[PDB]
Design a binder for this molecule. Structure first.
Ligand SMILES: C[As](C)(=O)[O-]
Ligand SMILES: C[As](C)(=O)[O-]
Ligand SMILES: C[As](C)(=O)[O-]
Ligand SMILES: [Zn+2]
Ligand SMILES: [Zn+2]
Ligand SMILES: [Zn+2]
Ligand SMILES: [Zn+2]
Ligand SMILES: [Zn+2]
Ligand SMILES: [Zn+2]
Length: 71
C-alpha cells in the first residue's frame, strides 16, 4: 500500500540511493555501492548477498512505482 511504499521511498531517499528517472538496475547498483564495506570486500559470499539483496530491494521499489522497469 501507499504507506508501506512511502516509507520505502522516504528511506531510500534518505539513504541517498533513490533519485529521479532511475531504472531498476541503477537503484540496485546504488544500494549495493552503499552496502559495500569491510565484509563484502573480504568474503565473496557477503559481496554476493549485498548484490542480491540490493536487487531484491530495487524490485520492491519498482513494484512500489519508485523506479522504471529495466528495458
Ligand atoms: C535481478 As533484476 C536488476 O532484473 O531485479
Ligand atoms: C522481475 As524484474 C522487472 O526486477 O527483472
Ligand atoms: C515519480 As517519483 C516515484 O520519482 O516521485
Ligand atoms: Zn518521489
Ligand atoms: Zn520524482
Ligand atoms: Zn551501469
Ligand atoms: Zn559490485
Ligand atoms: Zn565462505
Ligand atoms: Zn528482480
Amino acid at each position: 500500500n501507499w504507506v508501506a511504499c512511502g516509507i520505502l521511498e522516504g528511506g531510500l531517499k534518505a539513504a541517498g540511493v533513490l533519485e529521479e528517472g532511475q531504472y531498476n538496475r541503477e537503484l540496485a547498483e546504488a544500494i549495493a555501492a552503499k552496502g559495500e564495506g569491510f565484509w563484502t570486500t573480504q568474503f565473496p559470499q557477503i559481496g554476493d548477498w549485498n548484490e542480491d539483496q540490493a536487487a531484491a530491494l530495487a524490485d520492491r521499489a519498482q513494484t512500489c512505482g519508485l523506479v522504471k522497469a529495466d528495458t
